[PDB]
DNA sequence: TCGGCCGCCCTGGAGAATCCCGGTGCCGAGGCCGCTCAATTGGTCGTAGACAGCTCTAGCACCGCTTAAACGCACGTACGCGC
């Protein structure tokens, strides 16, 4: 899109919100209770802004197709310390590839 | 990204003009009257036209050549028409 503001500017800061009250929601150091986060967003960011997003949220992206189990072409990045979110993407016959 | 601009259908609402509907008034048309002259009737002549007869002119019909022109097909570019 030529005319976007990238990640500081316009709508793209709407994302640190998110961030606060994600921290804001997370239990305090001690307090060993479960707690889970998924954050998402499009493949095709600037490459500083994948950066900044990589030095906020603590994590690296995981990169994952729709198309193999969604026979969508939307590839996403998922921030998250979900446990085994690196694992290949699985296929259920409920799902539709075609 | 993403919010602000032109057809399309649908619809009808103000709105200036027009049709319909009454109310009044007037002057032009329908009807009555005298009268007088043009339509009618009767008769008579005179010739325009109806009709018989003849004739003889041209109009229609036919036929055979003879090319002059009408027809038909290709074709291509100039003009009719839509935008």
């Not at 500017?9 to 998110?18: Q, S």
């Not at 490459?47 to 995981?62: A, G, H, Q, T, Y």
Request: proline share 6%.
């Amino acid at each position: 899109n030529p005319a976007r503001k990238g990640l500081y500017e316009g709508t793209g800061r709407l994302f640190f919100e998110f961030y606060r009250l994600l921290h804001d929601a997370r239990p305090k150091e001690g307090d060993d209770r479960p707690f889970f986060w998924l954050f998402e967003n499009v493949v095709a960011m600037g490459v500083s802004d994948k950066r900044d997003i990589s030095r906020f949220l603590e994590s690296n992206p995981v990169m994952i197709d729709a198309k193999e189990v969604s026979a969508a072409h939307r590839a996403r990045y998922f921030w998250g310390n979900l446990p085994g979110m690196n694992r290949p993407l699985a296929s259920t016959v409920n799902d539709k590839l075609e």
